[PDB]
Amino acid sequence: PREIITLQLGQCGNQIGFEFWKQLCAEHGISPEGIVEEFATEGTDRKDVFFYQADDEHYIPRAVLLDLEPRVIHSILNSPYANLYNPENIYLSEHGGGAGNNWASGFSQGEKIHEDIFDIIDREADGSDSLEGFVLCHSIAGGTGSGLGSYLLERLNDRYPKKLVQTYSVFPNQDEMSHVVVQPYNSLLTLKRLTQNADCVVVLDNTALNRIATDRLHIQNPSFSQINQLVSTIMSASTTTLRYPGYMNNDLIGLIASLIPTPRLHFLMTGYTPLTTDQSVASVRKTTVLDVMRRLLQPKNVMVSTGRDRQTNHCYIAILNIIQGEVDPTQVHKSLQRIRERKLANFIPWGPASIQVALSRKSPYLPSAHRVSGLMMANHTNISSLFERTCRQYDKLRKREAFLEQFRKEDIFKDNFDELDNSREIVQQLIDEYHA
Amino acid sequence: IGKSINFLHQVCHDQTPASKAMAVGKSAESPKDAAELFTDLENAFQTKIDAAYFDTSKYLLDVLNKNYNLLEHMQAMRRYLLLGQGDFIRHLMDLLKPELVRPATTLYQHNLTGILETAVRATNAQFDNPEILKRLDVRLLEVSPGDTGWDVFSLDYHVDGPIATVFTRECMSHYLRVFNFLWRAKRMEYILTDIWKGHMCNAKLLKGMPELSGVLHQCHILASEMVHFIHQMQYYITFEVLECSWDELWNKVLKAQDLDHIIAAHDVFLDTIISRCLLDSESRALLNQLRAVFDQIIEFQNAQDALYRAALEELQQRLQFEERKKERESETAAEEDVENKRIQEFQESIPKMRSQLRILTHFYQGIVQQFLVLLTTSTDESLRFLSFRLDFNEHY
Numbered sequence: 058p059r060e061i062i063t064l065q066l067g068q069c070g071n072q073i074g075f076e077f078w079k080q081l082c083a084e085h086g087i088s089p090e091g092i093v094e095e096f097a098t099e100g101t102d103r104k105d106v107f108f109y110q111a112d113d114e115h116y117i118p119r120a121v122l123l124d125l126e127p128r129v130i131h132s133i134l135n136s137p138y139a140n141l142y143n144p145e146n147i148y149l150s151e152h153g154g155g156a157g158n159n160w161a162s163g164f165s166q167g168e169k170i171h172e173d174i175f176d177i178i179d180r181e182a183d184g185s186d187s188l189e190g191f192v193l194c195h196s197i198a199g200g201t202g203s204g205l206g207s208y209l210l211e212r213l214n215d216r217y218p219k220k221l222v223q224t225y226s227v228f229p230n231q232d233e234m235s236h237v238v239v240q241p242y243n244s245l246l247t248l249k250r251l252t253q254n255a256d257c258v259v260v261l262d263n264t265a266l267n268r269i270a271t272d273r274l275h276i277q278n279p280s281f282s283q284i285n286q287l288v289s290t291i292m293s294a295s296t297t298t299l300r301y302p303g304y305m306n307n308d309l310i311g312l313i314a315s316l317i318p319t320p321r322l323h324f325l326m327t328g329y330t331p332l333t334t335d336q337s338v339a340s341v342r343k344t345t346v347l348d349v350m351r352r353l354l355q356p357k358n359v360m361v362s363t364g365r366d367r368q369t370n371h372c373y374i375a376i377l378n379i380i381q382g383e384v385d386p387t388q389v390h391k392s393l394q395r396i397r398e399r400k401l402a403n404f405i406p407w408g409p410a411s412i413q414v415a416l417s418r419k420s421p422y423l424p425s426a427h428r429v430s431g432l433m434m435a436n437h438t439n440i441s442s443l444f445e446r447t448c449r450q451y452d453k454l455r456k457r458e459a460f461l462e463q464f465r466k467e468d469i470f471k472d473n474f475d476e477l478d479n480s481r482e483i484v485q486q487l488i489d490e491y492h493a
Numbered sequence: 494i495g496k497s498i499n500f501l502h503q504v505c506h507d508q509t510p511a512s513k514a515m516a517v518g519k520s521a522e523s524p525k526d527a528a529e530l531f532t533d534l535e536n537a538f539q540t541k542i543d544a545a546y547f548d549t550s551k552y553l554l555d556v557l558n559k560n561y562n563l564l565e566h567m568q569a570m571r572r573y574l575l576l577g578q579g580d581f582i583r584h585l586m587d588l589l590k591p592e593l594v595r596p597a598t599t600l601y602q603h604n605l606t607g608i609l610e611t612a613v614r615a616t617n618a619q620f621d622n623p624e625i626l627k628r629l630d631v632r633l634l635e636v637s638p639g640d641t642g643w644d645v646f647s648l649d650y651h652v653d654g655p656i657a658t659v660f661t662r663e664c665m666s667h668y669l670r671v672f673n674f675l676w677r678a679k680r681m682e683y684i685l686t687d688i689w690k691g692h693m694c695n696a697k698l699l700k701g702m703p704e705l706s707g708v709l710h711q712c713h714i715l716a717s718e719m720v721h722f723i724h725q726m727q728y729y730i731t732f733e734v735l736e737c738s739w740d741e742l743w744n745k746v747l748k749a750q751d752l753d754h755i756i757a758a759h760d761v762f763l764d765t766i767i768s769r770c771l772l773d774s775e776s777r778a779l780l781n782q783l784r785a786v787f788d789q790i791i792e793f794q795n796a797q798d799a800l801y802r803a804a805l806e807e808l809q810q811r812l813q814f815e816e817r818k819k820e821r822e823s824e825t826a827a828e829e830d831v832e833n834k835r836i837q838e839f840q841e842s843i844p845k846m847r848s849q850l851r852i853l854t855h856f857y858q859g860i861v862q863q864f865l866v867l868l869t870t871s872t873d874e875s876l877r878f879l880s881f882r883l884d885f886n887e888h889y
Binding site: 058059098099102103187214215218219221253254256302303304305306307308310311314315317318319320375386387389390396397404408409410411412413487 | 576577578579580583584587615616618619682686689690693694696697698700710713714717718720721722724725728732733736740885886887888889
């Protein structure tokens with residue numbers, strides 16, 4: 058019916074998808090090894106849209122996880138949520154990889170394991186006779202997720218041409234350049250494949266993570282154990298129309314169709330306010346829906362590093378405001394009434410704009426059926442500031458003679474560096490041209 | 494009281510309401526009258542019949558919950574004819590489309606029931622418990638087989654016995670009228686889904702030609718404007734009428750205490766929602782533009798694949814001819830001629846698409862301006878709410 062195959066790949070893409078499947082059992086009322094609660098069918102009306110359909114009421118995840126590093130998968134099998142995963146769909150015990158840290162490693166390893174990489178991931182494709190598409194849950198940081206992920210964006214474009222492609226890709230961190238220095242090279246090589254060899258992306262910045270991780274979360278030493286908490290909730294938040302019973306844009310080709318203006322303009326800004334557990338003691342007094350979307354357009358919950366004074370000459374075109382759970386829908390048109398009076402979104406002068414709001418009932422659970430949740434999927438034309446940030450860090454590195462002799466020994470014979478530079482400037486010029 | 498006491502005799506119950514104490518009271522009253530209270534008690538006679546009218550009513554509200562589930566079927570019909578839950582209808586309408594493109598025949602009925610029964614099983618694992626699937630069938634019309642086939646298919650909520658006391662002939666005869674506009678609303682939502690996937694399938698394979706780069710780019714802009722304007726209209730007009738009418742009937746059927754007030758709450762419900770959906774005698778200024786935008790999205794759709802298939806198939810001959818260039822060296826002037834003929838056919842299709850796009854965006858500009866003035870002309874009902882919403886969509 059609407060079966061999606063997630064493509065978890067890389068050192069960071071496997072960990073953000075590990076707790077994504079772990080989030081799904083707590084809201085479906087199911088255990089990874091059994092069914093102890095009856096809340097799975099009376100409370101939740103649809104479960105076989107991301108999981109594989111049941112053979113013994115055991116909803117297998119439709120997931121594949123490949124990585125060159127064996128460290129990310131050795132921290133999985135000792136956890137009690139790995140018995141839900143199957144040891145025959147992806148790998149058996151003692152799976153390995155390369156050495157290995159290179160973008161050209163996984164780019165060259167795709168055609169030497171070409172027979173095996175297109176054998177076991179295609180067995181899940183013909184399980185349903187109407188496949189939705191493929192989401193590449195991969196990474197841009199490092200050479201593991203960026204090297205091999207650029208290969209599958211090409212060969213799955215023609216072997217599966219009538220399928221939706223759209224990824225929840227995480228952006229790397231640009232604070233210092235000591236541990237990694239190959240960061241401007243492997244990022245722009247995948248970013249070219251994300252626009253012409255891929256339809257849509259969902260951007261997730263790393264410098265904007267610790268802006269939120271010290272905002273309300275109150276940590277002193279930033280660890281990697283907090284990167285899975287902001288990411289796994291908004292992943293399950295994006296499929297609330299798709300997993301839980303909704304009516305309009307209840308498919309993944311429903312939501313993405315109403316937000317993309319044009320190809321190579323698909324970078325969607327994400328926002329999510331409620332992350333604090335001591336808000337729970339004051340939501341008993343009928344906290345309404347009239348105050349939760351006034352702060353979405355206000356740049357506080359954003360996960361995109363952008364300029365603060367560059368929003369006057371940029372214009373919103375498509376903005377999504379997803380409320381979940383208890384909505385009190387007699388005032389949801391009242392919340393959309395107050396949008397035109399502030400004009401917090403700059404509107405495009407050539408065409409109409411749209412503020413789309415939708416709702417779906419959440420899990421039968423006490424932290425879910427009590428507190429209001431707001432998921433934002435914006436589309437603003439100030440996203441070229443990240444593309445100006447990455448390009449200015451790209452041409453400055455090529456004048457310092459950095460990784461021009463250390464990178465072209467394997468499988469690179471011609472200069473494909475300006476092939477990425479002009480196509481990035483094509484994106485940056487067509488964005489500003491789009492508001493005439 | 495006398496109409497409700499006869500309705501509980503043909504409910505497969507001969508039980509006097511909720512107790513045998515309704516016999517006791519009559520005997521007490523008759524002896525009391527026989528020896529005492531000779532003057533009529535018209536102030537007190539109306540008191541305990543009202544204390545009889547309230548108990549015979551809630552007991553008659555109690556016999557449905559044990560046997561028939563009357564107002565549970567009030568909620569269950571909203572999921573199919575009113576399309577409350579979309580997964581029942583979307584997994585329907587996916588499988589239902591390869592039958593609707595062809596015209597209908599006399600062999601049209603025998604397979605849709607198999608398509609229906611495989612669609613209600615793929616979405617359910619617990620809906621075999623209630624009695625909804627036996628009281629819901631498919632209704633077709635007497636239209637001749639020379640049609641497009643799309644307008645024949647419709648679902649109907651069947652009634653047999655004690656569900657048919659609350660559902661007369663006049664109820665589902667209006668429920669097909671509210672279905673046909675809502676089926677056409679989901680018809681437009683799914684054919685625009687196919688052409689949006691047609692935007693993203695064709696653009697990935699024609700990569701390699703610099704002329705067709707900017708050809709599809711501006712045409713995707715003018716197609717996205719008919720996408721975003723239909724979306725913020727069609728999602729909002731049917732969710733709002735869903736909103737003010739689900740919260741109208743469902744919350745008052747359990748606060749009033751009658752069986753005749755259930756239908757009195759119902760007979761005002763099912764004609765408010767269709768009057769806000771499509772049908773009034775004054776609403777001829779409503780369904781004239783919504784059918785003028787209905788055939789315009791058909792005209793925008795069939796012209797796209799009439800020019801995509803010209804733009805996509807002619808590229809496929811160019812790429813196989815490139816493969817013949819390397820094989821002739823391992824195994825000329827006419828080969829350059831046919832290349833110049835392809836470029837001329839590449840040159841032909843682009844102003845043919847430009848001319849067949851600039852004339853359809855003039856039609857859409859004429860539709861979007863006539864859509865405003867026709868919806869502002871009706872006779873002082875809740876149109877100020879309707880004239881409110883369409884100005885909010887085009888500007889914000």
